[model samples]
Target: QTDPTLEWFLSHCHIHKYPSKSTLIHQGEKAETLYYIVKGSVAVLIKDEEGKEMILSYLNQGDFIGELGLFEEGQERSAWVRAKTACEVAEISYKKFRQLIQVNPDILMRLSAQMARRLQVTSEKVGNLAFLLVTGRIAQTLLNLAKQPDAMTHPDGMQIKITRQEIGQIVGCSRETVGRILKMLEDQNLISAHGKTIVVYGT
Candidate 1:
């Protein structure tokens, strides 16, 4: 169910449009606003000192970004968000969000639930990282990507707009290993590759 405060936000907040591949937030940047995704998708990524970037999660419609600002007043963004496609969003200041959701139990409840769910998903990701083999982990990532509503579907199958490195980042494999696993999947007729996209069968 959609939260009523979200509807209120639509009426009160300005809708902003951004181009594809735009950086929505940066690591170590001061947090000022929380973005509500109205359309399109974004990837949460972090960079190491060695300059290698890893994608941690994807947020789509109804997902909130910069949510930690609600609790951590002086916090800097720990990760960056980048638009996967052209996006439309409502940017709400933490102060404004608090006022709006204070009386809106649905929105508050939903936010709490989402945060908890995110933590649970992160825990599972850690477990997958620790226990799953590279091939099994890549397969698991494909299944999860296939479940996204925004996954592009071709006549061949549902094409996940993900790169080999992105898959490696999620599965904790080297990019070369990711490429090998993908080839294995393609040879098995389990999936097909389309440039940067990985197209999976009915899976």
Candidate 2:
């Protein structure tokens, strides 16, 4: 389990064992329950406009699926979630989740943190390449670095010592491009730097 909250909540769920290759949820189907992975792996995919299936991501134990729909009314799924292995999942309905939150509000906070973690990976994977500009990507990278325990010091300061070449490699751009973006971020008062060491602000 990802958190104690999940451990507590799973006790109220109905665990279903799905065999390998089984479809857990199909795209465009109405979503009502959030499935929490108890064991094994699952794949998240979608069909492009060309009708070709594109695997967006793979998920494993401690992850949640169909969660985005829990907040909406009669929302359809955006992707196909299939069992990649013989899997055990605790399926919790939206009603049950509401009841859980009514009893323990901390559950929402815990799950929100988990959701943010997943969102960060997705943003880095898709946003860097498809959406965010180079400057935004650099700022995001610096903000992420500032969150690292090794990078942030006590009191009220955080800094990361990293090379533009490494950041370019991570952001999938050239070194010169990264340096230019860094300079732009500096001009915008978003970050400060001392050689390769960066101080991130306005997180």
Candidate 3:
């Protein structure tokens, strides 16, 4: 049986489907709708003037998006959100979200708990950049990816589907730099790569 809260949302909210690489949120754009991801993966990113992009984090099923803007009615989006794979999202207007909480007050706690977890990891990633070397960061990044809900459990170990370029964006390095560190990790038996799929081992 479906949870009553989600059932209520599905009946009341508009659902949207997006293709891979689609832009879901544009930074600095006016925000109105809040989204609950129903399927697939999305990446939050920020870009520089030269078009260099830095990944902030990844969101998957059960994650909420655009709630940051919904908190302040006139706020613009803080970062870009792109669908890493085809996705489905339940869209709720800010007004509807306000009513949602009134109907089920416990929903606020659920949202806040996940929000706190996301914020803590983001802060830790910033701290890691200041103190950790590239190799350490890469290992940490790989571990982080393996922890995602969408990560695959392989017969031999855990597998994550991510590219070197994506890892570089998250670690704040060029793809070549990430490649070198990954090679080093591979030799140490920390991870193994086959195409875009990377398998992580107990270290």
Candidate 1 residue-wise lDDT at 127: 30
User: Per-residue CA lDDT of candidate 2, range 59-137, in tens?
Assistant: 8887888777778777888888889899999888888898889899887776677788888864753435433576667
lDDT of 3: 0.79
lDDT of 1 by residue, 89-187 (tens): 878778887887866657767667777877885575343444457778889899899889989877767888899889888988789878877875675
Clashing pairs in 3: none
| CA deviation > 4 Å runs, candidate 1 | 1-4, 119-203
TM-score to true structure, per model: 0.59, 0.58, 0.60
| Residue-level lDDT tens digits of model 3 in 1-203 | 75876767667678899999999888888899888888999988886565556566779987888877667777888898999899998888888888978988666666677788878855743425543576677888888888889889986568999999998888788898777667755744457899999998641
> Residue 10 of candidate 3: its Cα lDDT?
66
Sorting all predicted structures by TM-score, with the top scorer first, yields 3, 1, 2
TM match of model 1 to true structure:
0.59
Question: What CA root-mean-square deviation does each model show from the true structure?
Answer: 11.1, 14.2, 11.5
Q: What are the clashing pairs of model 2?
A: none
Q: Where is model 2 more than 4 Å wrong at Cα? A: 1-4, 122-203
User: What number of clashing residue pairs does each candidate have, in the order they appear?
Assistant: 0, 0, 0
Give the higher-TM-score candidate: 2 or 3: 3
